[PDB]
Amino acid sequence: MKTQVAIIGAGPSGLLLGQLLHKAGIDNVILERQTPDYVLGRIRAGVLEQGMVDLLREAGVDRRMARDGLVHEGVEIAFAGQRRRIDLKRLSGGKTVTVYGQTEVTRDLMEAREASGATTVYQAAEVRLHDLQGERPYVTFERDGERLRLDCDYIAGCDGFHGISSQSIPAERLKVFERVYPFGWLGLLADTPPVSHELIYANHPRGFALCSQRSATRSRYYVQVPLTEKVEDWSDERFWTELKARLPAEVAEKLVTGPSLEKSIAPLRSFVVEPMQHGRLFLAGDAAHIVPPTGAKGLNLAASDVSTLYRLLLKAYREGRGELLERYSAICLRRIWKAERFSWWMTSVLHRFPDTDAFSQRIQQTELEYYLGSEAGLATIAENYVGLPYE
Ligand SMILES: Cc1cc2nc3c(=O)[nH]c(=O)nc-3n(C[C@H](O)[C@H](O)[C@H](O)COP(=O)(O)OP(=O)(O)OC[C@H]3O[C@@H](n4cnc5c(N)ncnc54)[C@H](O)[C@@H]3O)c2cc1C
């Protein structure tokens, strides 16, 4: 087996990169450890930046999104008995965000790929990368007990947070930046109409709550919980009661509840690795960095990493300008750090932290009061939320 670009992982990063490359005539093979079904079971993201939307259109997979996607022009933040709407369109200069689930985006990409006939190997076990610094790197894996070898020119590590790619860069070459938060998000997906046309982020004394959606008849809700919690200790009944407790009364009373389709706990963390490449290997998406969900940037950062990698591979293959690939990490890290700073800020002003003194509580409240009450303050939230420009 030989291909031009080997891609590890068939989550949205690998699929999006594989689609863009296939359409430009660059052959690629995607290797995925799990089954299509398993990948399709991950709920995750709900909010997309315009840059991700345009990239899906460029990859030719935007029909259903254009049809089913909900374009949002504002978001709301509730705190201390107040509800403040941030007009994203006005304050960002016409930009907006699109609500379309990650499950959907993935489904759409998996379909486009199957129809194009590009190679995809699910259940590829024991993936190992070799000769990363040579001119001929290769990937080895096993399918049906047989160990196959895949020869290629470049390898894109799009295997997420628990992937094998990042582990393949010499530890003495990497710089890891990390921060773990003392809480997670308990999410509940229900077949009910959302309580609001726009999202509502809520800072409440009992802890954070978020009212999101997937469509007009499908909702996604979250509440902040301690890392010590087990999803089995949270019945649907218990979740709805807690959620109602953390929302403004007028919002809590319009809430249509119902049984859950999905329920899980996602712990929060920030994680950056530098550089994002080694020899013929380039990391993308969660494989290289993690942001807490508060700012809705994870999938959106994978999109810009992929857009950057794709464009640099085009130059190398099409224009014989392979030296440009050395700039991969520099370009990506600039956008990554700004998104990390925003996700960190959002997380710190909206959540309840354990062991927090009186001065800090007061400062947290004042941050919200200032930023939501100043025209310049609102613009900083909005321009960051819709997403900063791609380089
Ligand atoms: C609760 C929550 C809410 C979120 N909300 C948002 C949102 O609203 N907006 C937003 O932008 N982001 C959000 N995100 C983040 C977003 O879900 C992720 O950043 C995105 O899933 C990452 O895409 P990826 O392709 O890099 O990785 P993944 O989705 O993790 O896929 C990586 C793939 O690699 C495969 N793999 C793993 N190891 C191997 C191996 N050894 N060999 C082969 N394959 C392997 C995996 O099975 C997986 O299929 C949210 C995340 C969560 C958890």
Buried/exposed code over 181-206 (b: 16+ C-beta within 10 A; e: otherwise): bebbbbbbbbebbbbbebbbbbbbee
88 contacts 75 by C-beta, under 8 angstroms: yes
73 contacts 50 by C-beta, under 8 angstroms: no
344 burial level (CB within 10 Å; 0-12, 13-18, 19+): middle
Domain locations along the chain: 1-72+96-180+269-351, 73-95+181-268+352-388
Q: Is the peptide bond before 275 cis (omega within 30 degrees of 0)?
A: yes
126 contacts 31 by C-beta, under 8 angstroms: no
Q: How far apart are CA 118 and CA 115, in angstroms?
A: 8
Q: How far apart are CA 163 and CA 1, in angstroms?
A: 22
298 CB under 6 A from ligand 1? yes
Nearest CA to 224 out of 112, 332, 124, 354 is that of: 354
Q: How far apart are CA 124 and CA 8, in angstroms?
A: 10
Helices (H), 246-280: 249-252
State the residue for tokens 């321009």.
383
According to the CATH classification, is domain 73-95+181-268+352-388 in 3.40.309.10?
Answer: no
Identified catalytic residue from 194, 293, 310, 351: 293
Experimental method: X-ray
The CATH number that domain 1-72+96-180+269-351 falls under is 3.50.50.60
Q: How far apart are CA 84 and CA 107, in angstroms?
A: 35
255 CB under 6 A from ligand 1? no
Nearest CA to 127 out of 83, 81, 160 is that of: 160
Buried/exposed code over 258-284 (b: 16+ C-beta within 10 A; e: otherwise): eebeebbbeebebbbbbbbbbbbbbbb
220 CB under 6 A from ligand 1? no
Q: How far apart are CA 186 and CA 243, in angstroms?
A: 10
- Gaps in the chain following residue numbers (C to N > 2.5 A): none
Nearest CA to 349 out of 368, 376, 362, 373 is that of: 368
Identified catalytic residue from 12, 22, 72, 137: 72
Distances (CA, A) of 303 to 57, 124, 171, 221, 375: 12, 24, 26, 24, 30
